[PDB]
Ligand binder design. Sequence first.
Ligand code: 39X
Length: 113
Amino acid sequence: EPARVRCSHLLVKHSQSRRPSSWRQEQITRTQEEALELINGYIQKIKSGEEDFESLASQFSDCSSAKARGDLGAFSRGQMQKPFEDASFALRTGEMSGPVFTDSGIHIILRTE
Ligand SMILES: O=C(N[C@H](Cc1nc2ccc(F)cc2[nH]1)C(=O)O)c1ccc2ccccc2c1
């Protein structure tokens, strides 16, 4: 395991998220169910090749990292929310996670380094 990994992510918030607002929406109104539907729709499009992970993150991620095409840069353990950390360190470089749940909402993660 490396000391740090570098990942990109696409976050879909919902009305029960810790901070239910984003750069793209003043108030997050969608349900948890709708957020998971959106995440699964993105996974299917990335798997078929219909959509690019970083291109989707740049315009649809509820995280301010959308401006960096989803890039969070490098992080060690003990920094990010634990389920996000565990999912990130379990990926190989160039691998994408399935849905990941944190207090911020639902994420898809792409490990880059
Ligand atoms: O907290 C941030 N944005 C939060 C959403 C969020 N991003 C997350 C990433 C990992 C995780 F475990 C939980 C998350 N909740 C926000 O914009 O409300 C955030 C964190 C680190 C960043 C690093 C680089 C660029 C933007 C960042 C935004």
